[PDB]
Amino acid sequence: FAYDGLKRQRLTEPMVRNEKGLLTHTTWEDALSRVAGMLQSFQGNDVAAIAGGLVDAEALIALKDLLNRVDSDTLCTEEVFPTAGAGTDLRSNYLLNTTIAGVEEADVVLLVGTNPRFEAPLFNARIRKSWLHNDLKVALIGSPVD
Amino acid sequence: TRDTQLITVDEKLDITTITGVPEEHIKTRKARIFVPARNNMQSGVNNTKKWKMEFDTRERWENPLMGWASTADPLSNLVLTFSTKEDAVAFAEKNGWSYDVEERKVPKPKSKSYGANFSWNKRTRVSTK
Amino acid sequence: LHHAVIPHGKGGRSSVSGIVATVFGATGFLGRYVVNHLGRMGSQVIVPHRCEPYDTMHLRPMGDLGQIIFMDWNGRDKDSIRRAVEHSSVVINLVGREWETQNFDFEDVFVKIPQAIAQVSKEAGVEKFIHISHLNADIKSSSKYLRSKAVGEKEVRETFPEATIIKPAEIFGREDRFLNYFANIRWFGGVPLISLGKKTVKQPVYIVDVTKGIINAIKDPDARGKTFAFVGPSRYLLFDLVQYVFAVAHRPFLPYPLPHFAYRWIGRLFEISPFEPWTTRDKVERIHTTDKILPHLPGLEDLGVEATPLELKAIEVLRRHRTYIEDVQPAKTIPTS
Amino acid sequence: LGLREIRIHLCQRSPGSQGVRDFIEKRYVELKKANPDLPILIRECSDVQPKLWARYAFGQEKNVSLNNFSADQVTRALENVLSSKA
Amino acid sequence: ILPGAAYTEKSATYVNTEGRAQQTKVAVTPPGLAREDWKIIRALSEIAGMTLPYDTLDQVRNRLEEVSPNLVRYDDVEGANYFQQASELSKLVNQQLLADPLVPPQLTIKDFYMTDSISRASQTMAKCVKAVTEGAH
Amino acid sequence: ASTSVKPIFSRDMNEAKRRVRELYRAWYREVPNTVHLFQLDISVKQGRDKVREMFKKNAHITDPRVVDLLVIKGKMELEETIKVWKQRTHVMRFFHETEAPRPKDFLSKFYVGHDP
Amino acid sequence: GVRTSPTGEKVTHTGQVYDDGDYRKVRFVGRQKEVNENFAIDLIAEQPVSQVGSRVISCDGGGGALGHPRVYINLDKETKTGTCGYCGLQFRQQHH
Amino acid sequence: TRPTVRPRNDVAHKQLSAFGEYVAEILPKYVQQVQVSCFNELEICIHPDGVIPVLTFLRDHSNAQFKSLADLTAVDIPTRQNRFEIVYNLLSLRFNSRIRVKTYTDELTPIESSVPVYKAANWYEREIWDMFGVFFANHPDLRRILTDYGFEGHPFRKDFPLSGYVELRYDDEVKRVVAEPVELAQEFRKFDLNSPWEAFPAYRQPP
Numbered sequence A: 001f002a003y004d005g006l007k008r009q010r011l012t013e014p015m016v017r018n019e020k021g022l023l024t025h026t027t028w029e030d031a032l033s034r035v036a037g038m039l040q041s042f043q044g045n046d047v048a049a050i051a052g053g054l055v056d057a058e059a060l061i062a063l064k065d066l067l068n069r070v071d072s073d074t075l076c077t078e079e080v081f082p083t084a085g086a087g088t089d090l091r092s093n094y095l096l097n098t099t100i101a102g103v104e105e106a107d108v109v110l111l112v113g114t115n116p117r118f119e120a121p122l123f124n125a126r127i128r129k130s131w132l133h134n135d136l137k138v139a140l141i142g143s144p145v146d
Numbered sequence B: 001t002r003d004t005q006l007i008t009v010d011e012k013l014d015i016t017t018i019t020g021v022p023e024e025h026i027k028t029r030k031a032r033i034f035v036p037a038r039n040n041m042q043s044g045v046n047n048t049k050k051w052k053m054e055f056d057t058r059e060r061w062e063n064p065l066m067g068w069a070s071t072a073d074p075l076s077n078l079v080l081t082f083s084t085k086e087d088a089v090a091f092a093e094k095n096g097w098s099y100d101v102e103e104r105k106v107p108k109p110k111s112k113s114y115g116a117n118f119s120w121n122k123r124t125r126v127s128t129k
Numbered sequence C: 001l002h003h004a005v006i007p008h009g010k011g012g013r014s015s016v017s018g019i020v021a022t023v024f025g026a027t028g029f030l031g032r033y034v035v036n037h038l039g040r041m042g043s044q045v046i047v048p049h050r051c052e053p054y055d056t057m058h059l060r061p062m063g064d065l066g067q068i069i070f071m072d073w074n075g076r077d078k079d080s081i082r083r084a085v086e087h088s089s090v091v092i093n094l095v096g097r098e099w100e101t102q103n104f105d106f107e108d109v110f111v112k113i114p115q116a117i118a119q120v121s122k123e124a125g126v127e128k129f130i131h132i133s134h135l136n137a138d139i140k141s142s143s144k145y146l147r148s149k150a151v152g153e154k155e156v157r158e159t160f161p162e163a164t165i166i167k168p169a170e171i172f173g174r175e176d177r178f179l180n181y182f183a184n185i186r187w188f189g190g191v192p193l194i195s196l197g198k199k200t201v202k203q204p205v206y207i208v209d210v211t212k213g214i215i216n217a218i219k220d221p222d223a224r225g226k227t228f229a230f231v232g233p234s235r236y237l238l239f240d241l242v243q244y245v246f247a248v249a250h251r252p253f254l255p256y257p258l259p260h261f262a263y264r265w266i267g268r269l270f271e272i273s274p275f276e277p278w279t280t281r282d283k284v285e286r287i288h289t290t291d292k293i294l295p296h297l298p299g300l301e302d303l304g305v306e307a308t309p310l311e312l313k314a315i316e317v318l319r320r321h322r323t324y325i326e327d328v329q330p331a332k333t334i335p336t337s
Numbered sequence D: 001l002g003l004r005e006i007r008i009h010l011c012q013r014s015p016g017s018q019g020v021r022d023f024i025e026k027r028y029v030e031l032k033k034a035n036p037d038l039p040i041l042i043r044e045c046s047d048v049q050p051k052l053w054a055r056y057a058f059g060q061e062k063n064v065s066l067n068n069f070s071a072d073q074v075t076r077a078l079e080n081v082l083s084s085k086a
Numbered sequence E: 001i002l003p004g005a006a007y008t009e010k011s012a013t014y015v016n017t018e019g020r021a022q023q024t025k026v027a028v029t030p031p032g033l034a035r036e037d038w039k040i041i042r043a044l045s046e047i048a049g050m051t052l053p054y055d056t057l058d059q060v061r062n063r064l065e066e067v068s069p070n071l072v073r074y075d076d077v078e079g080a081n082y083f084q085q086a087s088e089l090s091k092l093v094n095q096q097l098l099a100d101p102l103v104p105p106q107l108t109i110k111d112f113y114m115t116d117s118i119s120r121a122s123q124t125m126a127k128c129v130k131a132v133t134e135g136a137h
Numbered sequence F: 001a002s003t004s005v006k007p008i009f010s011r012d013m014n015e016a017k018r019r020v021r022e023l024y025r026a027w028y029r030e031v032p033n034t035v036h037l038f039q040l041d042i043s044v045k046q047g048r049d050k051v052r053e054m055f056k057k058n059a060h061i062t063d064p065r066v067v068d069l070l071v072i073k074g075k076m077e078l079e080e081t082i083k084v085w086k087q088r089t090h091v092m093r094f095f096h097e098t099e100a101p102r103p104k105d106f107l108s109k110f111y112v113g114h115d116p
Numbered sequence G: 001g002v003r004t005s006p007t008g009e010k011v012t013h014t015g016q017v018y019d020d021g022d023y024r025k026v027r028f029v030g031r032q033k034e035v036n037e038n039f040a041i042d043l044i045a046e047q048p049v050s051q052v053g054s055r056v057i058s059c060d061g062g063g064g065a066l067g068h069p070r071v072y073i074n075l076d077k078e079t080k081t082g083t084c085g086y087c088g089l090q091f092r093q094q095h096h
Numbered sequence H: 001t002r003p004t005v006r007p008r009n010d011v012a013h014k015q016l017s018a019f020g021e022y023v024a025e026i027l028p029k030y031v032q033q034v035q036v037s038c039f040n041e042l043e044i045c046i047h048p049d050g051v052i053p054v055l056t057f058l059r060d061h062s063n064a065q066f067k068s069l070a071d072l073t074a075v076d077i078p079t080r081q082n083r084f085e086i087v088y089n090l091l092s093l094r095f096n097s098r099i100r101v102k103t104y105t106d107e108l109t110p111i112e113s114s115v116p117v118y119k120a121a122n123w124y125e126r127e128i129w130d131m132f133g134v135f136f137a138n139h140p141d142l143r144r145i146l147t148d149y150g151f152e153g154h155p156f157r158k159d160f161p162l163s164g165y166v167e168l169r170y171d172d173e174v175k176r177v178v179a180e181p182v183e184l185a186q187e188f189r190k191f192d193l194n195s196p197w198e199a200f201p202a203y204r205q206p207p
């Protein structure tokens, strides 16, 4: 039902700050020239990027390649994941390794610091399915959510 | 067998030059080869039997006079039907279309037991009918 | 950009160019080409017209449904001007006449009307204004046409400072009054020429080149507030040009000299006609005006238009004037600057 | 001008990646100790030819094929990357 | 501000919590002057004199394969190993847990409906928050 | 096998190439008459360059049967022109005179729309 | 009913009206904007509620086969009328 | 019988079946399949090499005498290796009977012209060439018949778009009719009409 948010508050034109400090519509030519001018004058740690929660892989790699060409490595995401130890060197460190369908084969589940009902509702439905049909035992460390 | 004298041709079959399609709608198009998903609003499965080929969606804009949906894409409505995935791929190759194939998604067999509704010691016992 | 003027489509008849253009003088030679180019790409074109609706019928097929709108207007009524411009983003002034009538003289068409359009367009909030002047506009010219052009050009620049002023040379094309003018001199045995067609150098420009230049000016943010000169690639002697014109039309060419005084009476003699004169004193003075060289002004190449050689398009214009091997003999061109 | 990132691609089962798999199991932990702040992205994918990617300053990248390498060849291939810039 | 496209308006790759790569398909083109997001960056790189080496969607996906090959294996889950190696590096630096108890950011249904820009702009999601808070009335 | 097929006219590319060159000669000699007969505003050079451009775009074919059909179609096109079944509009449709030049670089396409 | 926008253009019963900067209103210059002035929403609201003496009532829109498909309307709720989904007529149970 | 149900004619069904076997026994070199429909129409499916021999036998044989070529057309079925099905519908005035002869071809395989057998076939084969792009060998005058001169493509192929690729208008600048890529003020609206429930069990196909 959230698809109706796609019809509201949409960004439809490039915008730059005018002399009064207000965002005003402009052309793609003009907006990119302003951005390109700044990017050509900064290098290294002077340039950084943050990627939000809805960005696609094609956009992520393109931005990383662009910032790498000014020798910047500050490509960040809003969502934290600890970098101590292996960090992101090993995929197994940050994946759901059992897989969603593997929940139906488990015989005990320990949930830690998560409300899967709201963070991943379809994943929580898979747990309930196994709780119902496989008599799965579920334990929770955290707040006692329903 | 035949009285007609055949020839040997090892070329890959390609008919792009003799189909009359403009260059734009051969090389810049992406064909999608898939078995349509069941419309979740209904239980009938009869529309999931055949393979389909469709093309990448392109711009539609509002007609200034009436607000109708205009298009400049001649392939916007073209949908082809195929018996097998291999037939669909063969058709796309000889026409020079780049394509992606999506494997068919058959529902997995389920274990259904009415008696389970009334289990003595399991959670499948229903609280209502 | 308001959501209705964002461009959509692929530049064809059913696309949305985002241009909303009021084209004054759309019913004439240059106007038909301008409207056609706006219509091709899916622009909204407002066509104020003074003439009969029957005289605007050739414009109707040039746009998709609803894309050509026709309004009545009067050059002396500023309210009719306001109704036609108040929704437009660009106003193009192609109003002009090669002769004077009882109701309108050269001051009216080239000074008062262009100033009225410019002033109303500025008050209406129109963003772009394109005004067609003349390459040889000059207040010292013997041609009253060219003197009014100079005065009108100055007033438009004062009224609408961000206006784009285009100053073309004599324009040739199917419906031109240039190559067709010379071809129709043959319709009388005499072929007069001030001096012998010497001392007059011409640099004519192709109609489509002017049209593309105007269209590219609408789309070019740089072009605002500038004055352009649209000229062809090759300069010619008036005698060579007319000789070439007759050669392409397969006509017998009989030159004979004349001074202005004997060339002004023939001009006066046909000025008596209650319609478009075949010729007039002013037309002769303009034809025998050497085309100015104005290297301080940008031209067609600054707008990304390649000037079309006259030799590549003369047949297109003059084929209808033929009586019924294509040696042609290209006319001699003055050495380039 | 120095090294910025290391990526190791390999298959989970193919014999052509056996040496790369051995290197990870035996030597990756020690490699990561010595290079605490160097990204060493290990990315497994079935049926790929193993490769070593090195990204240097300003987006320049080198790749070295590791197909059929031993664990020791992989070690030397990584040593050259760590030592020689580009 | 550079207007990009939403997930309904582009063919883009997303990797889910299992590591399975999947791609959206264009349902409608982006509104107004908005553009596909990787094309904005590719266009920016050309203006800046740092042109990226891909001009089509297939080319930028070939680039994805050079960084992480699993990103173009659509609808496939690629297993990841080396838990022991990860656990060895994890024990090298000992960090102390904080005392504060684990509290999820979402405790009740009212916190479910609005969690991103699309849902925060949804008028339907706003009615849902009102219903669970105020009531049916 | 499945590569043993029925020919159209040519049993191999060398036979097919002969027909191509014969068709090209026929078109080459027709252009001057076409420009005169249809009273076109293009030069004979422009017409012959257009003929060469049409032949070049199919230079990569290696299947004799495909080449046979290209020649068969090319000959039908020639017959339409020689017999004056075409009108001047049909002949001028090879030159796309009213179509504006669509941009080809990445940036120019990026500015105008969404198509690759 | 028919109201007007600040620019002077009439608002249709569907709420349509070109805003101030919309060039498309040029199509109405020297001509007119066709608007139907019998707003069905206002007309149906003028109709009185029928009081009936049963829990369920049926409506076919009047005129038999010249109306709409016959539907049956439940009137158990006393906090609202029963409305016909086809023609918008309203019914209310008297007493109960 | 049932007032709303079409009555069956079992005598004609048996007669057509027996004649179908008769044809298959006489021309085994070419006949691949013979079938009779529930509404009593006989179809002979043949190898494309058999066009002239089979049609000649059906026209001239004393027990056939199919003198009239009622219709000749093609059907495009993209899922088949030989996508084009060529259908000959013949009529016998002597025996007051009809028969359908079918064969196949692909985009590059010529079919033999049947003009020697039926002079009616001349224009029918030009139409098949024009609309489907099937070439007919030794046709006296094979060229487009229905499409515009210089038209590109074969519009009855299932993968040719309904509205084509180009459209026409008069252009005042060049003073002639010109062709340009097709743009539609209103796009044709594709409807998905098929029910997801099977309608005809008798025609069900193996999974």
Ligand SMILES: NC(=O)C1=CN([C@@H]2O[C@H](COP(=O)(O)OP(=O)(O)OC[C@H]3O[C@@H](n4cnc5c(N)ncnc54)[C@H](OP(=O)(O)O)[C@@H]3O)[C@@H](O)[C@H]2O)C=CC1
Pocket (backbone or CB within 6 Å): C024, C025, C026, C027, C028, C029, C030, C031, C049, C050, C051, C074, C075, C093, C094, C095, C096, C097, C098, C104, C109, C132, C133, C134, C135, C167, C168, C169, C170, C171, C172, C177, C178
């Ligand atoms: N053609 C050339 O060689 C050159 C032309 N120019 C300028 O270009 C512009 C147009 O050229 P061209 O198109 O050849 O001129 P045309 O005479 O071909 O068309 C003139 C236009 O002006 C309109 N017009 C004339 N007088 C009046 C008036 N009194 N009130 C209202 N409308 C009027 C006419 O409308 P109606 O049809 O109602 O009379 C017509 O649409 C003119 O300004 C001309 O000076 C500049 C340099 C050279």
Ligand SMILES: [Zn+2]
Pocket (backbone or CB within 6 Å): G059, G060, G061, G068, G084, G085, G086, G087, G088, G089
């Ligand atoms: Zn009712």
